[PDB]
Amino acid sequence: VSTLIPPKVVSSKNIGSAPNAKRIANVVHFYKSLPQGPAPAIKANTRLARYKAKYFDGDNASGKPLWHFALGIIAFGYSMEYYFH
Amino acid sequence: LTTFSLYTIIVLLVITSLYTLTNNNNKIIGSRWLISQEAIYDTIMNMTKGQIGGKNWGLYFPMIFTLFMFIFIANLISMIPYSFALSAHLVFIISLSIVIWLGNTILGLYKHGWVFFSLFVPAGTPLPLVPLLVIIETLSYFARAISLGLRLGSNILAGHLLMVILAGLTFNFMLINLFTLVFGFVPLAMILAIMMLEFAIGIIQGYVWAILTASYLKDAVYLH
């Protein structure tokens, strides 16, 4: 006798699958993400975004700003030594 | 007005730069500099969840964080050879310690009533010496008041003074003739070694502040 009609309705393998939850997530997350960004280091732009670019990028952990800032404090109280002299 | 005011401003500006000029506009990838301030976050998360863990630890996590960073930065700044007494103005550090101690004592009294004085009953011990163990528990409890400040103060102050006195001696070795300037460098190398030790122990002392005033807060929040 005639083969039954349950297989001709699908709406329980289309909404009844687990990656649907991931699908609706990653259509929003990925589709709505700019493939590229603006600029990594730019804070303090006044030729001191350049200071950030040379020293406070994630492209270096080089000791130069530390040295520079340290030397600043040496310059601060030392000048004041000759101001207090 | 004062010199002291100028270096307090400098501390504020250093701290601003670590959450401004160290990240690349907050990449999730992370920046080399910003990894440092991640690790600090993690070790105070895991330290103060370890100390003052309970049903809360995050409610006192900012307080312990600004106590970390202040001492952490100020024992590098105070160790620049032309930088003025902030922490080495002992009255500010000891005052900060006493303020926190009073702010624990008041917090304990307020939150835990007059059974706050059950904090100064320490254990179920034989009853004829239970009151004695209250007397010399309170004595040690307000020894916690001055100890916390005096640890940091002594370490930082002694380091700077030690270096300066020995510097003055090597000055006078090299102020007399060159045969004394030979083997005038051998003590100088000792001052360099002492400076290495003094930078190390200031970061160690910084951990000790924030663990001790987590330990005291553990006691204060969780009675006995």
mmCIF file of C-alpha atoms in Angstrom:
data_model
loop_
_atom_site.group_PDB
_atom_site.id
_atom_site.type_symbol
_atom_site.label_atom_id
_atom_site.label_comp_id
_atom_site.label_asym_id
_atom_site.label_seq_id
_atom_site.Cartn_x
_atom_site.Cartn_y
_atom_site.Cartn_z
ATOM 1 C CA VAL A 1 0.000 0.000 0.000
ATOM 2 C CA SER A 2 0.865 3.640 -0.539
ATOM 3 C CA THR A 3 4.050 4.895 1.142
ATOM 4 C CA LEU A 4 3.245 7.336 3.939
ATOM 5 C CA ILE A 5 3.706 11.095 3.652
ATOM 6 C CA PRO A 6 5.775 12.028 6.865
ATOM 7 C CA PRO A 7 9.044 12.306 4.792
ATOM 8 C CA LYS A 8 7.495 15.068 2.628
ATOM 9 C CA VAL A 9 7.293 17.503 5.539
ATOM 10 C CA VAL A 10 10.541 18.850 6.952
ATOM 11 C CA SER A 11 10.462 21.445 9.670
ATOM 12 C CA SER A 12 12.090 19.346 12.353
ATOM 13 C CA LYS A 13 15.455 18.696 10.722
ATOM 14 C CA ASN A 14 15.586 22.304 9.527
ATOM 15 C CA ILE A 15 14.816 23.890 12.896
ATOM 16 C CA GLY A 16 15.582 20.700 14.772
ATOM 17 C CA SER A 17 19.342 20.838 14.290
ATOM 18 C CA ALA A 18 21.870 22.206 16.772
ATOM 19 C CA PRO A 19 24.051 24.340 14.382
ATOM 20 C CA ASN A 20 20.975 26.576 13.750
ATOM 21 C CA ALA A 21 21.889 28.268 17.028
ATOM 22 C CA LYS A 22 25.448 28.794 15.699
ATOM 23 C CA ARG A 23 24.141 29.873 12.285
ATOM 24 C CA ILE A 24 22.033 32.760 13.534
ATOM 25 C CA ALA A 25 25.022 33.783 15.660
ATOM 26 C CA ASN A 26 27.640 33.809 12.903
ATOM 27 C CA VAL A 27 25.409 35.497 10.306
ATOM 28 C CA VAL A 28 25.334 38.438 12.708
ATOM 29 C CA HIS A 29 28.932 38.220 13.931
ATOM 30 C CA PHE A 30 30.382 37.521 10.536
ATOM 31 C CA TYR A 31 28.770 39.644 7.907
ATOM 32 C CA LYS A 32 28.836 42.622 10.276
ATOM 33 C CA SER A 33 32.559 42.626 10.919
ATOM 34 C CA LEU A 34 34.717 45.101 9.029
ATOM 35 C CA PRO A 35 37.477 42.938 7.478
ATOM 36 C CA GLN A 36 40.126 45.511 8.385
ATOM 37 C CA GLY A 37 40.397 48.221 11.050
ATOM 38 C CA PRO A 38 41.260 51.950 11.183
ATOM 39 C CA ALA A 39 44.763 52.257 12.730
ATOM 40 C CA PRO A 40 46.373 50.444 15.742
ATOM 41 C CA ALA A 41 48.218 53.273 17.499
ATOM 42 C CA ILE A 42 47.072 56.842 17.131
ATOM 43 C CA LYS A 43 46.319 57.929 20.702
ATOM 44 C CA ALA A 44 48.021 61.216 21.613
ATOM 45 C CA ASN A 45 48.282 62.406 17.979
ATOM 46 C CA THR A 46 50.245 65.647 17.975
ATOM 47 C CA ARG A 47 53.570 64.054 16.926
ATOM 48 C CA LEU A 48 53.232 61.932 20.047
ATOM 49 C CA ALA A 49 51.050 59.427 18.287
ATOM 50 C CA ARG A 50 54.514 59.005 16.741
ATOM 51 C CA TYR A 51 55.880 58.454 20.265
ATOM 52 C CA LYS A 52 53.193 55.767 20.700
ATOM 53 C CA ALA A 53 53.965 54.367 17.265
ATOM 54 C CA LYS A 54 57.634 53.914 18.018
ATOM 55 C CA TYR A 55 57.366 52.856 21.628
ATOM 56 C CA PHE A 56 53.888 51.813 22.754
ATOM 57 C CA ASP A 57 52.928 49.659 19.798
ATOM 58 C CA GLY A 58 52.278 45.978 20.287
ATOM 59 C CA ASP A 59 55.048 45.595 17.704
ATOM 60 C CA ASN A 60 57.683 46.131 20.394
ATOM 61 C CA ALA A 61 58.263 45.831 24.109
ATOM 62 C CA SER A 62 61.585 47.656 23.542
ATOM 63 C CA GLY A 63 62.910 49.475 26.591
ATOM 64 C CA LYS A 64 63.180 52.917 24.992
ATOM 65 C CA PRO A 65 60.057 54.724 26.499
ATOM 66 C CA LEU A 66 61.041 53.401 29.923
ATOM 67 C CA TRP A 67 64.513 54.873 29.426
ATOM 68 C CA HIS A 68 63.032 58.123 28.113
ATOM 69 C CA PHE A 69 60.528 58.499 30.970
ATOM 70 C CA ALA A 70 63.185 57.582 33.554
ATOM 71 C CA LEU A 71 65.568 60.155 32.090
ATOM 72 C CA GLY A 72 62.727 62.679 32.326
ATOM 73 C CA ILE A 73 62.448 62.186 36.091
ATOM 74 C CA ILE A 74 66.251 62.379 36.358
ATOM 75 C CA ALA A 75 65.966 65.639 34.428
ATOM 76 C CA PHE A 76 63.168 66.846 36.656
ATOM 77 C CA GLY A 77 64.659 66.662 40.108
ATOM 78 C CA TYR A 78 68.229 67.312 38.862
ATOM 79 C CA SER A 79 67.195 70.618 37.264
ATOM 80 C CA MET A 80 65.425 71.401 40.508
ATOM 81 C CA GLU A 81 68.696 70.585 42.323
ATOM 82 C CA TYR A 82 70.294 73.439 40.415
ATOM 83 C CA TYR A 83 67.108 75.472 41.092
ATOM 84 C CA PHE A 84 67.485 74.799 44.838
ATOM 85 C CA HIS A 85 71.222 75.415 44.731
ATOM 86 C CA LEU B 1 52.179 73.830 46.096
ATOM 87 C CA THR B 2 54.718 71.331 47.362
ATOM 88 C CA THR B 3 57.217 69.059 45.595
ATOM 89 C CA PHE B 4 55.107 66.204 47.034
ATOM 90 C CA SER B 5 52.096 67.490 45.089
ATOM 91 C CA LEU B 6 54.114 67.414 41.841
ATOM 92 C CA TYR B 7 55.169 63.784 42.174
ATOM 93 C CA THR B 8 51.615 62.671 43.143
ATOM 94 C CA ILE B 9 50.428 64.144 39.858
ATOM 95 C CA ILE B 10 53.249 62.246 38.101
ATOM 96 C CA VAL B 11 52.019 58.934 39.594
ATOM 97 C CA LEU B 12 48.512 59.676 38.317
ATOM 98 C CA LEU B 13 49.810 60.333 34.805
ATOM 99 C CA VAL B 14 51.850 57.124 34.697
ATOM 100 C CA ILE B 15 48.781 55.106 35.689
ATOM 101 C CA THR B 16 46.628 56.803 33.030
ATOM 102 C CA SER B 17 49.138 55.837 30.332
ATOM 103 C CA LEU B 18 48.936 52.092 31.072
ATOM 104 C CA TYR B 19 45.267 51.920 30.025
ATOM 105 C CA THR B 20 45.565 54.442 27.228
ATOM 106 C CA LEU B 21 49.032 54.385 25.641
ATOM 107 C CA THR B 22 49.806 50.689 25.864
ATOM 108 C CA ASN B 23 46.948 49.059 23.920
ATOM 109 C CA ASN B 24 46.323 49.316 20.178
ATOM 110 C CA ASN B 25 42.749 50.583 20.618
ATOM 111 C CA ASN B 26 41.977 47.373 22.438
ATOM 112 C CA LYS B 27 42.815 44.649 19.944
ATOM 113 C CA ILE B 28 41.612 41.254 21.172
ATOM 114 C CA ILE B 29 44.941 39.873 19.897
ATOM 115 C CA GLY B 30 46.669 41.896 22.629
ATOM 116 C CA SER B 31 49.675 44.206 22.698
ATOM 117 C CA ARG B 32 53.051 43.397 24.229
ATOM 118 C CA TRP B 33 52.680 46.149 26.810
ATOM 119 C CA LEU B 34 49.034 45.340 27.493
ATOM 120 C CA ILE B 35 49.979 41.758 28.389
ATOM 121 C CA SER B 36 51.695 43.113 31.511
ATOM 122 C CA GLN B 37 48.485 44.679 32.785
ATOM 123 C CA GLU B 38 46.647 41.472 31.976
ATOM 124 C CA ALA B 39 48.959 39.480 34.212
ATOM 125 C CA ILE B 40 48.598 41.970 37.062
ATOM 126 C CA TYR B 41 44.825 41.651 36.701
ATOM 127 C CA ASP B 42 45.073 37.865 36.775
ATOM 128 C CA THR B 43 47.340 37.583 39.787
ATOM 129 C CA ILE B 44 45.169 39.914 41.867
ATOM 130 C CA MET B 45 42.102 38.108 40.635
ATOM 131 C CA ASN B 46 43.640 34.853 41.721
ATOM 132 C CA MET B 47 45.146 36.369 44.859
ATOM 133 C CA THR B 48 42.158 38.201 46.187
ATOM 134 C CA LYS B 49 39.779 35.438 45.149
ATOM 135 C CA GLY B 50 42.220 33.343 47.134
ATOM 136 C CA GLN B 51 42.438 35.656 50.144
ATOM 137 C CA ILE B 52 39.069 37.338 50.409
ATOM 138 C CA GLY B 53 37.239 34.712 48.418
ATOM 139 C CA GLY B 54 33.829 34.043 49.831
ATOM 140 C CA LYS B 55 30.543 35.163 48.373
ATOM 141 C CA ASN B 56 32.361 38.277 47.251
ATOM 142 C CA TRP B 57 35.896 39.253 46.495
ATOM 143 C CA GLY B 58 35.215 41.402 43.449
ATOM 144 C CA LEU B 59 33.549 44.011 45.635
ATOM 145 C CA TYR B 60 36.931 44.704 47.210
ATOM 146 C CA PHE B 61 38.908 43.946 44.041
ATOM 147 C CA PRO B 62 39.262 47.576 42.834
ATOM 148 C CA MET B 63 40.450 48.671 46.265
ATOM 149 C CA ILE B 64 43.149 46.029 46.300
ATOM 150 C CA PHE B 65 44.017 46.895 42.699
ATOM 151 C CA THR B 66 44.629 50.567 43.331
ATOM 152 C CA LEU B 67 46.644 49.565 46.362
ATOM 153 C CA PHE B 68 48.663 47.269 44.136
ATOM 154 C CA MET B 69 49.380 49.667 41.358
ATOM 155 C CA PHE B 70 50.161 52.644 43.579
ATOM 156 C CA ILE B 71 52.909 50.881 45.487
ATOM 157 C CA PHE B 72 54.020 49.018 42.382
ATOM 158 C CA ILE B 73 54.621 52.219 40.473
ATOM 159 C CA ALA B 74 55.829 54.274 43.430
ATOM 160 C CA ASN B 75 58.743 51.984 44.212
ATOM 161 C CA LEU B 76 60.167 52.573 40.788
ATOM 162 C CA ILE B 77 59.490 56.299 40.714
ATOM 163 C CA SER B 78 60.847 56.778 44.229
ATOM 164 C CA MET B 79 63.895 54.809 43.000
ATOM 165 C CA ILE B 80 64.825 57.304 40.286
ATOM 166 C CA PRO B 81 67.985 59.058 41.701
ATOM 167 C CA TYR B 82 66.376 62.510 41.546
ATOM 168 C CA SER B 83 62.867 61.870 42.843
ATOM 169 C CA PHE B 84 61.354 63.251 46.002
ATOM 170 C CA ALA B 85 59.943 61.638 49.136
ATOM 171 C CA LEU B 86 56.405 60.373 48.495
ATOM 172 C CA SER B 87 56.486 56.882 49.911
ATOM 173 C CA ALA B 88 59.751 57.904 51.545
ATOM 174 C CA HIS B 89 57.672 60.557 53.179
ATOM 175 C CA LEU B 90 56.686 57.878 55.650
ATOM 176 C CA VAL B 91 53.787 59.859 57.025
ATOM 177 C CA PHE B 92 51.821 59.301 53.839
ATOM 178 C CA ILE B 93 52.394 55.534 53.741
ATOM 179 C CA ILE B 94 51.856 54.931 57.455
ATOM 180 C CA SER B 95 48.822 57.206 57.347
ATOM 181 C CA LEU B 96 47.441 55.179 54.451
ATOM 182 C CA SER B 97 47.992 52.018 56.472
ATOM 183 C CA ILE B 98 46.220 53.403 59.554
ATOM 184 C CA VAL B 99 43.310 54.628 57.420
ATOM 185 C CA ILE B 100 42.831 51.169 55.965
ATOM 186 C CA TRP B 101 43.163 49.616 59.419
ATOM 187 C CA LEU B 102 40.506 51.892 60.860
ATOM 188 C CA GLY B 103 38.392 51.300 57.765
ATOM 189 C CA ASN B 104 38.585 47.584 58.469
ATOM 190 C CA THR B 105 37.839 47.988 62.168
ATOM 191 C CA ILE B 106 34.817 50.210 61.491
ATOM 192 C CA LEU B 107 33.685 47.880 58.686
ATOM 193 C CA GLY B 108 33.851 44.949 61.110
ATOM 194 C CA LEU B 109 32.040 46.757 63.934
ATOM 195 C CA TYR B 110 29.322 48.019 61.609
ATOM 196 C CA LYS B 111 28.766 44.795 59.684
ATOM 197 C CA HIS B 112 29.188 42.383 62.549
ATOM 198 C CA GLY B 113 27.916 44.407 65.491
ATOM 199 C CA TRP B 114 29.295 44.043 69.004
ATOM 200 C CA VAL B 115 29.951 40.388 68.145
ATOM 201 C CA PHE B 116 32.849 42.017 66.287
ATOM 202 C CA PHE B 117 34.516 41.592 69.696
ATOM 203 C CA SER B 118 34.074 37.823 69.151
ATOM 204 C CA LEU B 119 36.855 38.354 66.554
ATOM 205 C CA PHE B 120 39.075 38.976 69.553
ATOM 206 C CA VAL B 121 38.047 35.676 71.081
ATOM 207 C CA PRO B 122 40.292 33.463 68.955
ATOM 208 C CA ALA B 123 39.488 29.849 69.804
ATOM 209 C CA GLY B 124 37.750 27.396 72.081
ATOM 210 C CA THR B 125 40.482 26.862 74.630
ATOM 211 C CA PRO B 126 40.293 26.168 78.422
ATOM 212 C CA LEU B 127 37.986 28.739 80.023
ATOM 213 C CA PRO B 128 40.364 30.175 82.721
ATOM 214 C CA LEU B 129 42.641 31.486 79.931
ATOM 215 C CA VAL B 130 39.929 32.526 77.465
ATOM 216 C CA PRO B 131 39.963 36.221 78.671
ATOM 217 C CA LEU B 132 43.789 36.354 78.553
ATOM 218 C CA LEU B 133 43.658 35.307 74.906
ATOM 219 C CA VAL B 134 41.333 38.269 74.303
ATOM 220 C CA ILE B 135 43.790 40.741 75.856
ATOM 221 C CA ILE B 136 46.795 39.611 73.850
ATOM 222 C CA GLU B 137 44.658 39.185 70.756
ATOM 223 C CA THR B 138 43.573 42.807 70.774
ATOM 224 C CA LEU B 139 47.178 43.793 71.465
ATOM 225 C CA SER B 140 48.254 42.005 68.324
ATOM 226 C CA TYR B 141 45.195 43.271 66.446
ATOM 227 C CA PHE B 142 46.277 46.891 66.702
ATOM 228 C CA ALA B 143 49.788 45.757 66.135
ATOM 229 C CA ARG B 144 48.358 45.104 62.671
ATOM 230 C CA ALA B 145 47.697 48.825 62.579
ATOM 231 C CA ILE B 146 51.304 49.956 62.499
ATOM 232 C CA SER B 147 53.008 46.881 61.093
ATOM 233 C CA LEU B 148 51.547 47.146 57.590
ATOM 234 C CA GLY B 149 52.801 50.671 57.084
ATOM 235 C CA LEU B 150 56.090 50.157 58.811
ATOM 236 C CA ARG B 151 57.087 47.250 56.558
ATOM 237 C CA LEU B 152 56.939 49.309 53.396
ATOM 238 C CA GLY B 153 58.351 52.451 54.947
ATOM 239 C CA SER B 154 61.409 50.797 56.379
ATOM 240 C CA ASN B 155 62.263 48.965 53.196
ATOM 241 C CA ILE B 156 62.073 51.906 50.817
ATOM 242 C CA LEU B 157 63.673 54.458 53.125
ATOM 243 C CA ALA B 158 66.549 52.231 54.138
ATOM 244 C CA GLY B 159 67.359 51.405 50.546
ATOM 245 C CA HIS B 160 67.725 54.994 49.441
ATOM 246 C CA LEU B 161 69.758 55.982 52.483
ATOM 247 C CA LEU B 162 72.060 52.976 52.218
ATOM 248 C CA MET B 163 72.892 53.766 48.637
ATOM 249 C CA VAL B 164 73.497 57.448 49.319
ATOM 250 C CA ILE B 165 75.852 56.881 52.271
ATOM 251 C CA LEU B 166 77.914 54.339 50.325
ATOM 252 C CA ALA B 167 77.858 56.672 47.295
ATOM 253 C CA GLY B 168 79.347 59.357 49.526
ATOM 254 C CA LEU B 169 82.116 56.992 50.590
ATOM 255 C CA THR B 170 83.020 56.059 47.001
ATOM 256 C CA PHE B 171 82.903 59.768 46.239
ATOM 257 C CA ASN B 172 85.698 60.267 48.788
ATOM 258 C CA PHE B 173 87.666 57.265 47.454
ATOM 259 C CA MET B 174 87.667 58.934 44.058
ATOM 260 C CA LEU B 175 88.193 62.430 45.489
ATOM 261 C CA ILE B 176 91.626 61.333 46.631
ATOM 262 C CA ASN B 177 94.286 60.084 44.216
ATOM 263 C CA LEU B 178 93.947 57.550 41.433
ATOM 264 C CA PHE B 179 95.327 54.585 43.412
ATOM 265 C CA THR B 180 92.234 54.950 45.638
ATOM 266 C CA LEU B 181 90.076 55.436 42.534
ATOM 267 C CA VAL B 182 91.464 52.003 41.720
ATOM 268 C CA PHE B 183 89.544 49.873 44.252
ATOM 269 C CA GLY B 184 87.082 52.748 44.481
ATOM 270 C CA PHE B 185 85.097 50.916 41.815
ATOM 271 C CA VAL B 186 84.988 47.675 43.846
ATOM 272 C CA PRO B 187 82.577 49.230 46.440
ATOM 273 C CA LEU B 188 80.755 51.007 43.571
ATOM 274 C CA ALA B 189 79.868 47.574 42.175
ATOM 275 C CA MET B 190 78.395 46.809 45.603
ATOM 276 C CA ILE B 191 76.109 49.883 45.295
ATOM 277 C CA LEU B 192 74.945 48.625 41.866
ATOM 278 C CA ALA B 193 74.182 45.233 43.407
ATOM 279 C CA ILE B 194 72.273 46.878 46.260
ATOM 280 C CA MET B 195 70.248 48.859 43.735
ATOM 281 C CA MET B 196 69.310 45.621 41.976
ATOM 282 C CA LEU B 197 68.217 44.174 45.287
ATOM 283 C CA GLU B 198 66.258 47.304 46.150
ATOM 284 C CA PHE B 199 64.255 47.275 42.956
ATOM 285 C CA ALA B 200 63.439 43.619 43.536
ATOM 286 C CA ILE B 201 62.328 43.967 47.141
ATOM 287 C CA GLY B 202 60.059 46.885 46.337
ATOM 288 C CA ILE B 203 57.968 44.741 44.040
ATOM 289 C CA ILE B 204 58.081 41.967 46.653
ATOM 290 C CA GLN B 205 56.962 44.448 49.312
ATOM 291 C CA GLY B 206 54.130 45.523 47.037
ATOM 292 C CA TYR B 207 52.790 41.977 46.961
ATOM 293 C CA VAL B 208 53.154 41.822 50.704
ATOM 294 C CA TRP B 209 51.045 44.942 51.222
ATOM 295 C CA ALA B 210 48.189 43.687 49.151
ATOM 296 C CA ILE B 211 48.224 40.192 50.584
ATOM 297 C CA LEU B 212 48.419 41.435 54.141
ATOM 298 C CA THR B 213 45.575 43.857 53.701
ATOM 299 C CA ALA B 214 43.715 41.055 52.029
ATOM 300 C CA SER B 215 44.498 38.788 54.981
ATOM 301 C CA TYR B 216 43.278 41.447 57.405
ATOM 302 C CA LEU B 217 40.166 41.926 55.310
ATOM 303 C CA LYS B 218 39.635 38.146 55.272
ATOM 304 C CA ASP B 219 39.665 38.299 59.066
ATOM 305 C CA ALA B 220 37.453 41.355 59.198
ATOM 306 C CA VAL B 221 34.790 40.068 56.820
ATOM 307 C CA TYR B 222 34.888 36.465 58.007
ATOM 308 C CA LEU B 223 34.875 36.549 61.826
ATOM 309 C CA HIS B 224 37.455 34.569 63.796
#
